[PDB]
Write a protein that binds this ligand. Structure first.
Ligand SMILES: Cc1c(CO)cnn1-c1ccc(F)cc1
Ligand SMILES: Cc1c(CO)cnn1-c1ccc(F)cc1
Ligand SMILES: [Cl-]
Ligand SMILES: [Cl-]
Lengths: 133, 136
């Protein structure tokens, strides 16, 4: 469905990246976060939920989801907790050299993934949500 | 254009917030950034451009836009360089005491601003409708 996202973590250069995939489109939002903690996870989810209609998020149900913080953020935002990601690392690989900081490379990779084309993932998410509306 | 954004800075609690407004819809993306520098501005603009189809930005043309970095990032992403602050601040003010960290309060405020229905469509619904229409 249109409001359904998957949230996973992935690790590079000793750092933690959260990757959110909009399941129907393949569109991705990803960011390096300071640590894999409830507080940083909640922050990431709140950010995502303000930008797209997030109804449900499928997660790995690990340690950073057992605490009060993520529960509180999902409650507040009205979110239920109920192939793109190796590719993301591959693109980061292709572009790593052009950026000093991993965080920059991550955002270049997100850009490339979402714009690649007859439809890009970015066009697909928009069409799907507009149709739902 | 569907692809036109305005980028402004605003300041609270000794911290810098960049606010991007999609002009046709009133949809906002905003984040606290470490400092108002070319490098952090470039980073913010690359993030935005990967999430929405950014063709042109209108900025204040100040110091963080004179350097090689923002110019290089905009080149790369194919971006041309050619009320909210207050409203967003008001919502932040309203929620500030519910979050420890300003950064959290900012993202709650963005959520509220983008979902608010004054009657009706929210800004979030409008941006999606406008861009979907343009695509078709
Ligand atoms: C701007 C662009 C390209 C080429 O830059 C490929 N997909 N998109 C895109 C991405 C997201 C949209 F909402 C609409 C279009
Ligand atoms: C989920 C929601 C609300 C709350 O019902 C208000 N606007 N939106 C919204 C925001 C962005 C969209 F693309 C679609 C809908
Ligand atoms: Cl995780
Ligand atoms: Cl600025």
């Amino acid at each position: 469905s249109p409001g359904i996202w998957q949230l996973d973590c992935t690790h590079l250069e000793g750092k933690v990246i959260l990757v959110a995939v909009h399941v129907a489109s393949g569109y991705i939002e990803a960011e390096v976060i300071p640590a894999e903690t409830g507080q940083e996870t909640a922050y990431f989810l709140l950010k995502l939920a303000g930008r797209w209609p997030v109804k449900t998020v499928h997660t790995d149900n690990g340690s950073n989801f057992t605490g009060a913080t993520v529960r509180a953020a999902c409650d507040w935002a009205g979110i239920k907790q109920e192939s793109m990601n190796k590719e993301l690392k591959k693109i980061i690989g292709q572009v790593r050299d052009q950026a000093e900081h991993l965080k920059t490379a991550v955002q270049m990779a997100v850009f490339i993934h979402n714009h690649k084309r007859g439809y890009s993932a970015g066009e697909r998410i928009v069409d799907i949500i507009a149709t739902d509306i």
